[PDB]
Every structure is written in C-alpha cells, then in structure tokens.
Design an enzyme around this catalytic site. Structure first.
Site, PDB file in Angstrom:
ATOM      1  N   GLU A 212      -8.263   7.660  -2.571  1.00 34.00           N
ATOM      2  CA  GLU A 212      -6.899   7.555  -2.080  1.00 34.00           C
ATOM      3  C   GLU A 212      -6.035   8.720  -2.555  1.00 34.00           C
ATOM      4  O   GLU A 212      -5.388   9.393  -1.742  1.00 34.00           O
ATOM      5  CB  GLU A 212      -6.243   6.227  -2.506  1.00 34.00           C
TER       6      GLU A 212
ATOM      7  N   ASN B  72       2.862   8.990   7.045  1.00 33.24           N
ATOM      8  CA  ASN B  72       2.084   8.447   8.140  1.00 33.24           C
ATOM      9  C   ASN B  72       2.822   8.726   9.428  1.00 33.24           C
ATOM     10  O   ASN B  72       4.003   9.054   9.399  1.00 33.24           O
ATOM     11  CB  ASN B  72       1.878   6.958   7.919  1.00 33.24           C
TER      12      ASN B  72
ATOM     13  N   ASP C 281       3.844   6.680  11.680  1.00 29.39           N
ATOM     14  CA  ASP C 281       4.895   5.710  11.944  1.00 29.39           C
ATOM     15  C   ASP C 281       6.141   5.977  11.097  1.00 29.39           C
ATOM     16  O   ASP C 281       7.072   5.170  11.076  1.00 29.39           O
ATOM     17  CB  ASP C 281       4.388   4.269  11.745  1.00 29.39           C
TER      18      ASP C 281
ATOM     19  N   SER D  36       6.367   5.970   7.855  1.00 28.15           N
ATOM     20  CA  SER D  36       6.283   5.451   6.498  1.00 28.15           C
ATOM     21  C   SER D  36       5.552   6.474   5.597  1.00 28.15           C
ATOM     22  O   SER D  36       5.007   7.469   6.084  1.00 28.15           O
ATOM     23  CB  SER D  36       5.578   4.101   6.476  1.00 28.15           C
TER      24      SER D  36
ATOM     25  N   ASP E 187       2.902   6.943   1.990  1.00 30.81           N
ATOM     26  CA  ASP E 187       2.019   6.317   0.998  1.00 30.81           C
ATOM     27  C   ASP E 187       2.283   6.997  -0.355  1.00 30.81           C
ATOM     28  O   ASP E 187       2.314   8.235  -0.428  1.00 30.81           O
ATOM     29  CB  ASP E 187       0.560   6.501   1.385  1.00 30.81           C
TER      30      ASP E 187
ATOM     31  N   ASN F  29       1.980   1.833   0.629  1.00 27.55           N
ATOM     32  CA  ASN F  29       2.874   2.097   1.761  1.00 27.55           C
ATOM     33  C   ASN F  29       4.329   1.595   1.688  1.00 27.55           C
ATOM     34  O   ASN F  29       4.605   0.466   1.283  1.00 27.55           O
ATOM     35  CB  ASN F  29       2.199   1.604   3.045  1.00 27.55           C
TER      36      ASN F  29
ATOM     37  N   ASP G 234      -2.867 -10.304  -0.624  1.00 31.40           N
ATOM     38  CA  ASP G 234      -2.260 -10.498   0.689  1.00 31.40           C
ATOM     39  C   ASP G 234      -3.114 -11.169   1.755  1.00 31.40           C
ATOM     40  O   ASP G 234      -2.664 -11.359   2.887  1.00 31.40           O
ATOM     41  CB  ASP G 234      -1.780  -9.158   1.217  1.00 31.40           C
TER      42      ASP G 234
END
Length: 129
Positions: free
Chosen positions: A35, A46, A48, A50, A52, A59, A101
């Site tokens: 990562e 990203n 969209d 957003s 990281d 995110n 989650d």
C-alpha cells in the site's frame, strides 16, 4: 517515516494487530508494503476526488476528514493528516474499524491482489517479535 519490515511488524503487534479479526501479522505487514511501501507519509489521489493516506492508505471518502472530499463520512473521527504521523497509533485504530466493516481485509485492494492467499508468513520471517 519509512519503517523497516521488522520494525513495523513489532509496532503493529504491540498495537494489537496480530490476529485481529483473524488476520495474522504477516497479512498487515504485507498490506503496508504494497500500500505505502512502509512510508507513513504516502498519499494518493483517486479519480473520485478522494485521497488515500498513510501506511495503510486509508480513504478520505469514509474514514477521515481531509476537508476536501464532498460527502466524506469521517468514520474514524480524525483529520486525514493524523494518518501520516511517524506514530502509527491512529492508522492502526482506524484500520481496526475498517477491517471490521464486514469486508475484512478485502477493503485493501493491494492486500486482495498481492497478499491474499500467498505465504504471508514470509513477511515477519526472521523478526524478533
């Protein structure tokens, strides 16, 4: 801060990640490697909009507030910048919520594609834990 493989493994263990939700420590070290490459200051935008953040690339759309992600939910109740600290405590506490989650570690795309089903034990191999 760029962690060394065994230094990170030991920090994560101390922070209760070894076997958290059934994922051995080798999984968490492998995920961090792919990562952020063990770099706490890693960030990636990203498509969209957003971003990281940190060692585990958490995110901004769901977990932290960066003040620039419209509709962001801030589930870990922290500013995304806290995720870039040399002290990995925030990154670990937030990761515990993410992994819980419902999707497990599949939440991390590099884990699913590069760690899942591989000999993750090799990641802590040789470390004094």
């Amino acid at each position: 801060k760029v962690f060394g493989r065994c230094e990170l493994a030991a920090a994560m263990k101390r922070h209760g990640l070894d076997n958290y939700r059934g994922y051995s420590l080798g999984n968490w070290v492998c995920a961090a490697k792919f990562e952020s490459n063990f770099n706490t200051q890693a960030t990636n935008r990203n498509t969209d909009g957003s971003t990281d953040y940190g060692i585990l690339q958490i995110n901004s759309r769901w977990w932290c507030n960066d003040g620039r992600t419209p509709g962001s939910r801030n589930l870990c109740n922290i500013p995304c910048s806290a995720l870039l600290s040399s002290d990995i405590t925030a990154s670990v506490n937030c990761a515990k919520k993410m992994v819980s989650d419902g999707n497990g570690m599949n939440a991390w795309v590099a884990w699913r594609n590069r760690c899942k089903g591989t000999d993750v034990q090799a990641w802590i191999r040789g470390c004094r834990l």
